[PDB]
């Protein structure tokens, strides 16, 4: 073997130029697609909030049009999924993870139009779903589509182009090129065996989609939190505790998402009409809350800067938290096309702030600023539920640019992944794939 | 399939023993990195004090500068050549071998050799980084605990070795994230699955990073301040800069390998001609560490300066070439030390220079040479050692200019792409490939 290794070392990092250039076209397509999606969502939320003015007088007619609009768009979303692409439901990350394992098809000719327009409906309707889901899956499929269109043969190409499309998909969702690469090499990739995924190829794709993102989203961060304070060493233990909390809650939150997945399957028993209508109800519920309590509906990005600043009261945070735990579950578990990734950032932030507030009054000598805990917790839920800490820590960093909080951030996210491991929790994306992969057998 | 399902449901379940031991490892590595770092600083200090007492009479102090660096350098080469040949050079290629189960981890030898050995070369003012010493001392620390607690299994051997290495990188640059990315992008077995627990590496990194912070807080390794931003119509320039780093990467590799051979002749492997050669190169570095500091030393000192545009174009070219020479002499000479940090310095300087030229060619871009400096800082690490992701993240963690992320990624990627298309190879792999082959031959 020592003789083979030598042969391999001398041959390391030599990715077929075809794969590299195709990683470029993919990244570019994924980025343009993420922009389009992002724009469509924004346009719909616009139209909807534009309707709530033509009826801002008759309050009852208003709470009605808010609901109907969100319901009609949500239903349209659930429909497209249930009718033309069942796989394009929920996140899509699990699904793409399956494809990397060669255990799930990448029906791009179906998913692309379904996941795009479908999410446009659910996200554009104000539902508690992130863009990650739609973009990472659209990304992967974009990667497959190019593979098929150029008949690029050979494992490496199939796995690499799929993995880049996924990374580019994540990158363009949060404007985080590094998180997109780390996501692939820590979570998306086959977790138990070697793989022929070219990191350098993923990079190119990410870069390309990130540039596409920048070409249309210049000068306006997704989350501007400003420069928070620093974190003294004698303050670190507090972030461990916060990690321990995210850690015991991570698994629990997973049980709920999986449980709620079942519990909600009953309401329609898989019936496309009871589903579409159930989703239409959940959708309408979100558009409603998106006017009587916005912080409980929508993606959640908006409330992050606010919570980090310490502008919410302890009471409002608990309200927002619980309410979002409910709206996230209802939207994601219901199988609506959308991610649960961003929603978790919001939950993490809120929880983190709340922890911080308490920390502040308990330790004035620490000169704390609840916001450092908000940031520390922002990716902690992604650490305890998804179990992809490195990707979370790096994602938060790329979005909140407060690198001096790196230790606290690592300590919280690590505390989370440690407590989520020691309380029986499982990588939520794996658990979902493990279910879909089982339901693909069980029925035989 | 049914297998996978069984695995998914069992994913991320690392034996609590491994995790707790990763913590002790990290803590030890960090405490070690601190001790090493302090020793180097103390020696460079003493050397400084010796010149003040013999300040008058230039030729006298130019002599004591040389001797002191020579005497410490020889002491360094000796300890390596005599008690641990493997603890020479970087140590990273070596540790990479161990992760492959292709090289031993003689910690009872390497720890004291690499530590006190590097103390001599680094403390003497040579052009070598701390990464080499710390990453290797790290892995060995990781092996030492595995052995002392008779922990059994692959996972534990690979994990504790991997974490000790990451913690080793982390405590060298105060970059926990680089430490982790290095292992999962460069260090780890590059062609087959491995039982390395990321979560365990994390804990170790954190623990050594905290150890670092308990002794170095309030003083960044590299303070460059907040640089300007980078317009999109400015990105192509970073591609070009990456293309340059990419053609120079392989070339710089050939020189390091070639200079390894060319220098082997001077002593033919003879411990005495080696120790004396090293004693010469060492003395040469402590001499330059008084008649042209920017050509000797680790190079960290000139990064902030060069990024600020405080060097003239001429001074940069001088510094560059001079450093290309001193880096090669110190590293290729097999002295215990890293070539990692020195490459940061070269990347910087080269970057600045590119910048300055960019500034005058495009006033409409309102460029600031320093953004190219930072883009290049990890670009050599990207063209030579081919670990871009770790480079980009390392620069970020040290320069804290995240708005330069696209430029940085574009330069580093341009580098790894051109280094690939010009036949270059991962310098750490090429070195291991040499070692591994020179063994079965």
């Amino acid at each position, epitope marked *: 073997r020592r003789r083979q290794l030598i042969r391999q070392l001398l041959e390391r990092d030599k990715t077929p130029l075809a794969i590299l250039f195709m990683a470029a076209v993919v990244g570019t397509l994924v980025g343009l697609a993420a922009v389009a999606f992002d724009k469509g969502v924004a346009w719909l939320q616009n139209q909807r909030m534009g309707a709530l003015v033509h009826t801002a007088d008759n309050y009852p007619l208003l709470l009605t049009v808010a609901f109907l609009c969100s319901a009609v768009l949500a239903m349209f979303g659930y429909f497209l999924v249930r009718k033309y692409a069942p796989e394009a439901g929920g996140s899509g990350i699990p699904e793409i993870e399956g494809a990397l394992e060669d255990q799930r098809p990448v029906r791009w000719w179906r998913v692309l139009p379904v996941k795009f327009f479908g999410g446009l409906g659910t996200l554009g309707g104000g539902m508690v779903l992130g863009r990650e889901g739609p973009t990472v899956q659209i990304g992967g499929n974009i990667g497959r589509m190019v593979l098929d269109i150029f008949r690029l043969k050979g494992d490496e190409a199939r796995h690499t182009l799929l993995a880049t499309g996924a990374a580019a998909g994540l990158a363009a969702a949060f404007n985080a090129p590094l998180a997109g690469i780390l996501f692939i090499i820590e979570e998306m990739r086959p977790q138990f065996r070697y793989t022929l995924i070219s990191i350098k190829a993923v990079f190119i794709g990410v870069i390309m989609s990130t540039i596409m993102y920048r070409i249309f989203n210049h000068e306006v961060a997704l989350i501007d939190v400003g420069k928070l304070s620093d974190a003294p060493l004698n303050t670190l233990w507090l972030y461990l505790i916060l990690g321990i909390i995210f850690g015991i809650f991570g698994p629990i939150f997973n049980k709920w998402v999986l449980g709620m997945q079942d519990l909600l399957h009953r309401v329609h028993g898989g019936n496309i009409t009871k589903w579409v209508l159930m989703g239409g109800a959940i959708g309408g519920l979100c558009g409603l809350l998106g006017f009587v309590a916005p912080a409980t509906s929508g993606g959640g990005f908006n409330l992050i800067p606010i919570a980090t600043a310490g502008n919410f009261s302890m009471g409002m945070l608990v309200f927002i938290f619980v309410a979002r735990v409910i709206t996230t579950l209802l939207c994601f578990s219901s199988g609506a096309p959308g991610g649960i990734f961003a929603p978790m950032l919001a939950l993490g932030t809120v929880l983190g702030t709340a922890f911080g507030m308490v920390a502040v009054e308990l330790f*004035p*000598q620490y000169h704390l600023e609840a916001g450092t805990f908000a940031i520390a917790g922002m990716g902690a839920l992604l650490a305890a539920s998804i179990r992809a800490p490195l990707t979370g820590i790096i994602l938060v960093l790329e979005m909140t640019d407060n690198y001096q909080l790196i230790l606290p951030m690592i300590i919280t996210g690590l505390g989370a992944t440690l407590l989520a491991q020691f309380t029986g929790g499982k990588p939520l994306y794996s658990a979902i794939l493990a279910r879909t992969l089982a339901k693909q057998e069980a029925e035989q | 399939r049914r297998q996978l399902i069984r695995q998914l449901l069992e994913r991320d379940k690392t034996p609590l023993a491994i995790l707790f031991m990763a913590a002790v490892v990290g803590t030890l590595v960090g405490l070690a990195a601190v001790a090493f770092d302090k020793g180097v600083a103390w020696l460079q200090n003493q050397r400084m004090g010796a010149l003040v007492h013999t300040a008058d009479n230039y030729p006298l102090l130019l002599t004591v500068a040389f001797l002191c660096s020579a005497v410490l350098a020889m002491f360094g080469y000796f300890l390596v050549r005599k008690y641990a040949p493997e603890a020479g050079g970087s140590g990273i290629p070596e540790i990479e071998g161990a992760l492959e189960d292709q090289r031993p981890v003689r910690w009872w030898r390497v720890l004291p050799v690499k530590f006190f050995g590097g103390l001599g070369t680094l403390g003497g003012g040579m052009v070598l980084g701390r990464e080499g010493p710390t990453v290797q001392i790290g892995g060995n620390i990781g092996r030492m605990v595995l052995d002392i607690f008779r922990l059994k299994g692959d996972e534990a051997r690979h994990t504790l070795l991997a974490t000790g290495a990451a913690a080793g990188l982390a405590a060298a640059f105060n970059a926990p994230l680089a430490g982790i990315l290095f292992i999962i992008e460069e260090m780890r077995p590059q062609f087959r699955y491995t039982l390395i627990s990321i979560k365990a590496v994390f804990i170790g990194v954190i623990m050594s990073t905290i150890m670092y912070r308990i002794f170095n807080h309030e003083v960044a390794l590299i303070d460059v301040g907040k640089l300007s931003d980078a317009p999109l119509n400015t990105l192509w320039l970073y591609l070009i800069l990456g293309i340059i780093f990419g053609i120079f990467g392989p070339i710089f590799n050939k020189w390091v390998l070639g200079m390894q051979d060319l220098l082997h002749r001077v002593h033919g492997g003879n411990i005495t001609k080696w120790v004396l050669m090293g004693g010469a190169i060492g003395g040469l570095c402590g001499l330059l560490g008084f008649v042209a500091p920017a050509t000797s030393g680790g190079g960290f000192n000139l990064i902030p300066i060069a990024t600020a545009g405080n060097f003239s174009m001429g001074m940069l070219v001088f510094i560059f070439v001079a450093r290309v020479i001193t880096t090669l002499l110190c590293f290729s000479s097999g002295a215990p030390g890293g070539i990692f940090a020195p490459m940061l310095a070269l990347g910087t300087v080269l970057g600045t220079a590119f910048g300055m030229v960019a500034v005058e060619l495009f006033p409409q871009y309102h460029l600031e040479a320093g953004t190219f400096a930072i883009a290049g800082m990890g670009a050599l690490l990207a063209a030579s050692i081919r670990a871009p992701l770790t480079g980009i993240i390392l620069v970020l963690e040290m320069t804290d200019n995240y708005q330069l992320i696209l430029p940085m990624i574009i330069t580093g990627l341009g580098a790894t792409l051109l280094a690939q298309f010009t036949g270059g190879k991962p310098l750490y792999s090429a070195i291991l490939a040499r070692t591994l082959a020179k063994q079965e031959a």
Partner: antibody, heavy 120, light 107 residues
């Protein structure tokens, strides 16, 4: 780094005065500012502190509104209003930038201080 | 709030001499700081986190202690060492100061 506090002087009992502290030589923000005072021939005593964004302002255990520490980062100036001034308030007042090593904060840099005399 | 009591309230020691002053706390404290105050000038952070010297403080100066007893020490106290030293804690809020110790040049 310089801290120049002014405003001190003679104040009639029951009166109120506003002490000022002009900061220069560093980014006034990022820093928690604090007032401390030293009564003639006696020890130091913390008055209170104010974080960078004025979101937090703590005072030594004392009369509800006896002290009002405010700051204007736009003028890089710290302020200390004292009310219902009594002899106990006669003292040298120091503004001090706050910082820390391991995390147990200290009074990083102090100014020369302004003397306050409470008398009729 | 924590009461810091500095042992010798006043002490005299000739130049070149091991001088040691105590700072006892009513309760438990950690990483106390020390400030030097020369007649007519503002207090100066001398020693912090129990034993770290502030940049510029001669090495003859050292400090140590723990729990409820700390001390600042001068190995060979120079002339420009005459001053009042105040210990301060903030391991507990609100921070408190010692009554101070006046170091005078015995002659």
């Amino acid at each position: 780094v310089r801290l120049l506090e002014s405003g001190g002087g003679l104040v009639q009992p029951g009166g109120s005065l506003k002490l000022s502290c002009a900061a220069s030589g560093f980014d006034y923000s990022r820093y928690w500012m604090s007032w401390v005072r030293q009564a003639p021939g006696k020890g130091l005593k913390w008055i209170g502190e104010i974080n960078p964004v004025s979101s937090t302002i703590n005072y030594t255990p004392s009369l509800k509104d006896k002290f009002i520490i405010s700051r204007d980062n736009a003028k890089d100036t710290l302020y200390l209003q004292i009310s219902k001034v009594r002899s106990e308030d006669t003292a040298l007042y120091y503004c001090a930038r706050l910082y820390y090593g391991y995390g147990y904060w200290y009074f990083d840099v102090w100014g020369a201080g302004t003397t306050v005399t409470v008398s009729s | 709030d924590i009461v810091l009591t500095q042992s010798p309230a006043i002490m005299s020691a000739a130049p070149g001499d091991k001088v040691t002053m105590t700072c006892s706390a009513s309760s438990s404290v950690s990483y106390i700081h020390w400030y030097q105050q020369k007649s007519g000038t503002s207090p100066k952070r001398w020693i912090y986190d129990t034993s770290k010297l502030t940049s510029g403080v001669p090495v003859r100066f050292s400090g140590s202690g723990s729990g409820t007893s700390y001390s600042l020490t001068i190995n060979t106290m120079e002339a420009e060492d005459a001053a009042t030293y105040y210990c301060q804690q903030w391991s507990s809020h609100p921070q408190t100061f010692g009554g101070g110790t006046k170091l005078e040049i015995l002659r």
